Amino acid sequence: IIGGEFTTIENQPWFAAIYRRHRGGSVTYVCGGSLISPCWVISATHCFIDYPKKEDYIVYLGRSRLNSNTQGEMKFEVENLILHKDYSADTLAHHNDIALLKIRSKEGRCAQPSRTIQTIALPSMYNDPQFGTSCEITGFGKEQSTDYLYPEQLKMTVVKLISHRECQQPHYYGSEVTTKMLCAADPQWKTDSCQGDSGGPLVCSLQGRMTLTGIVSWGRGCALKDKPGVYTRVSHFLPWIRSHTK
Ligand SMILES: COC(=O)Nc1cccc2ccc(C(=N)N)cc12
Q: Which residues line ligand 1 (CB under 6 A)?
């Protein structure tokens, strides 16, 4: 997250921190995710496509820091790694950038809701917020495009949804951004999601309900003028989510 504010997991309790175990035992941060039901975390296929082995992943819930075992946090392994069959990546655009991770503790249990671990509601069909709506993003992603390290403390920011017609403008993304993708950015281009924030939530309050409207997917640079953050539009994927969580 470029700009914005440092936060804690109690403010973003649906946030899942996803890591990968390498040969030799080193563990590195991969992507963010969102808890949609006790056994299920939703993220982006691009985070996993190159290492599609469920055994490699570690998922934390209730974790506020990149290298601290936050009081009340829960550690999980991945029982099922479901990637979208029609996923693909162009130079910029990522297609069907959605993945499901069925989580399980070493004891075989799913998440136990608490003050720091909570689910996030899915949107309803054909009901996304109007353009101009303010939504929040959360992640352990880069604080500056030129950084190589990720921030130790969890960050959040607020961005505004951008219409498909605006995002398809020539100086924006043209025909590279599709109706299955949602654009969002800061009108002043000072704050945004960045590399490392992928798979994380774009949460919008709609009709008084906090909803998982998007999943961080892609973007040209970070907080770059006329280059919004591009998010998987969760409402389009409701039949796929329902079918793959059954
Ligand atoms: C410096 O360019 C990047 O690091 N871009 C990005 C790489 C990987 C994922 C990204 C996701 C969102 C964005 C964005 N601009 N919001 C940018 C991303």
A: 145, 192-195, 197-198, 216, 218-219, 221-222, 229
Q: Resolution, rounded to a tenth of an Å?
A: 1.8
Best mutation site among 193, 202, 224, 226 for ligand 1, i.e. most ligand atoms within 8 A of its Cβ? 193
Question: How far apart are alpha carbons 100 and 80 in whole angstroms?
Answer: 8
From CA 160, how far away is CA 71, in angstroms rounded? 33
CATH topology of domain 1-12+120-235: Thrombin, subunit H (2.40.10)
For residue 118, the SS3 value is coil
Which tokens hold the place of 198?
A: 């992928």
Measured CA to CA, the distance from residue 209 to residue 121 in angstroms comes to 8
Domain ranges of the chain: 1-12+120-235, 13-119+236-246
